[PDB]
């Protein structure tokens, strides 16, 4: 047998490499540069025609299997990591591309949350997945994902990128280099997603709960006269060479707060753990609480894990969660690989198990015969 390849198709970035390795070999933006198109189209797009999606995935998988990885597709197996409740037609297409065009031996559709649990070694743990599109949580108890007690909110990368763009356009101060030393607002109508992502990573950080709670009430201005903490210094960011955008200190520590803002509904990234944990079985409560896992690149943002764990323990004392989750000890697990590449590492650890892989995985001979991929929906 040969070392099975692991792919993990995401909206922002795709993880790729081989099984039984310390981390992924290639990690790249999930896009393709088609002739005529100035900006490259995104390879994973939900709610489009199958033929157009088929062509994009055919183009992308080709780049992964030749330019990034150097190996024959037909020779060795595949371990496709994809999140639970991934759209039906997308997963059906992705398999149909691998089985028909590339003619792979067998694909294994592992849920990202159960794979993240294997990397630690613990059999039972709560898993939060703060991705690009949606920040999803799914309790895993001793190998069994509990779909009953699922939770998701659109407070990921996309929702954060959009919030940054909005704030920058309000307090817009750019030095074009054409008598634009004076503050010039909205010279460009929209900012490209590639720039916004680079600003987010380098400039913006996650504030402490004490400082963050003041920032929330400050921008609200709820019958108070200038009750904001002192912001960090303003950082100057180059746009397309000559144009120098002066990023305000307030924007850096306020952009993140949309994730941890209550917004009346009581629906934050913090609340989603406690909302799910309260809905879980009464016996499983204390085991899941003690074993928390924080995957996804959105949680890589500096000082996110401290704010989350703090915001949890504050929301615990709130009267809604005070009865059930009152006297619970919330402890976070530190996975071996980085927060972005926890999902991938599980699939590699699973891919190394040649004996179990072949049995669980769906063979091409079965797919060609039936034409029915197994899912958590009815058969």
């Amino acid at each position: 047998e040969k070392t099975a390849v692991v792919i993990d198709l995401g909206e922002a970035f795709t993880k790729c490499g081989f099984a039984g390795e310390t981390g992924p070999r290639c990690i790249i933006p999930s896009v393709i540069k088609k002739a005529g198109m100035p900006k490259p189209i995104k390879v994973v797009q939900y709610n489009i025609n199958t033929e157009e999606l088929y062509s994009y995935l055919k183009e992308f998988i080709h780049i992964l299997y030749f330019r990034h990885l150097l190996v024959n597709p037909r020779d060795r197996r595949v371990v496709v990591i994809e999140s639970v409740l991934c759209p039906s037609h997308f997963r059906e297409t992705l398999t149909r591309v691998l089985f028909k065009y590339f003619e792979v031996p067998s694909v294994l559709l592992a849920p990202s949350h159960l794979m993240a649990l294997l990397t630690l070694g613990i059999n039972s743990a709560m898993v939060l997945d703060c991705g690009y599109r949606e920040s999803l949580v799914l309790p895993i108890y001793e190998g069994i994902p509990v779909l009953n007690c699922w939770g998701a909110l659109p407070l990921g990368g996309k929702a954060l990128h959009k919030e940054l763009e909005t704030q920058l356009l309000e307090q817009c101060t750019v030095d074009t280099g054409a008598a634009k030393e004076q503050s010039l607002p909205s010279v460009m109508g929209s900012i490209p997603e590639g720039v916004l992502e680079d600003i987010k990573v380098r400039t913006c950080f996650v504030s402490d709960l004490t400082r963050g709670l003041k920032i929330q009430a400050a921008k609200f201005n709820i019958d108070g006269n200038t009750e904001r903490p002192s912001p960090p210094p303003n950082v100057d960011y180059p746009l397309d060479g000559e144009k120098i955008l002066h990023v305000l200190g307030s924007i850096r520590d306020s952009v993140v707060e949309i994730l941890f803002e209550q917004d009346n509904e009581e629906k934050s990234v913090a609340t989603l753990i406690l909302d799910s944990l309260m809905q879980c079985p009464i016996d499983t409560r204390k085991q899941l609480a003690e074993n928390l896992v924080i995957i996804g690149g959105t949680s890589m943002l500096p000082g996110f894990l401290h704010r989350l764990l703090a915001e949890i323990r504050y929301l615990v004392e709130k009267p809604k969660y005070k009865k059930t989750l009152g006297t619970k000890t919330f402890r976070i697990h530190t996975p071996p690989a980085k927060a972005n590449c926890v999902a991938w590492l599980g699939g590699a650890i699973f891919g190394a198990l040649q004996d179990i892989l072949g049995s669980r995985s769906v063979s091409k001979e079965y797919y060609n015969q039936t034409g029915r991929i197994p899912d958590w929906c009815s058969l």
Binding site: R67, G121, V206, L292, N340
Partner: protein
């Protein structure tokens, strides 16, 4: 253990003896599970009231090229080995062979079997 269990279960179904007890039925490796920290390290108080040089911190593109330990600072970021390129050979569905390349494709523009639509 699961393979042996699945094999034993499968050969029992294939036999179709209804689990007939002819003979008597029935070293361990134990990993310690990772310890959960009570409080994760907070964001350093330096980040508050300090000028951020965009030269010192690394962009996403150059962060992600070193995935095993993608470092925020530039001083940590080490140079990775150069990525090897591929020499493609085409094979059809109905037909067998089609075209291919030599064993010394480095500094060579020769095809072992030249085949193209413009050449027929």
């Amino acid at each position: 253990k699961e393979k042996v269990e699945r094999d034993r279960k499968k050969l029992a179904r294939r036999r179709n003896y209804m689990p007939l007890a002819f003979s008597q039925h029935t070293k361990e490796i134990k990993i310690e599970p990772a310890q959960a920290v009570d409080e994760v390290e907070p964001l350093p108080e330096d980040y508050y009231t300090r000028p951020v040089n965009l030269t010192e911190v690394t962009t996403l593109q150059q962060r992600l090229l070193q995935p095993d330990f993608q470092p925020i600072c530039a001083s940590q970021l080490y140079p990775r080995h150069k990525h090897l390129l591929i020499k493609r050979s085409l094979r059809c569905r109905q037909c067998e062979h089609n075209l291919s390349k030599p064993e010394f494709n480095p500094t060579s523009i020769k095809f072992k079997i030249q085949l193209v639509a413009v050449n027929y």
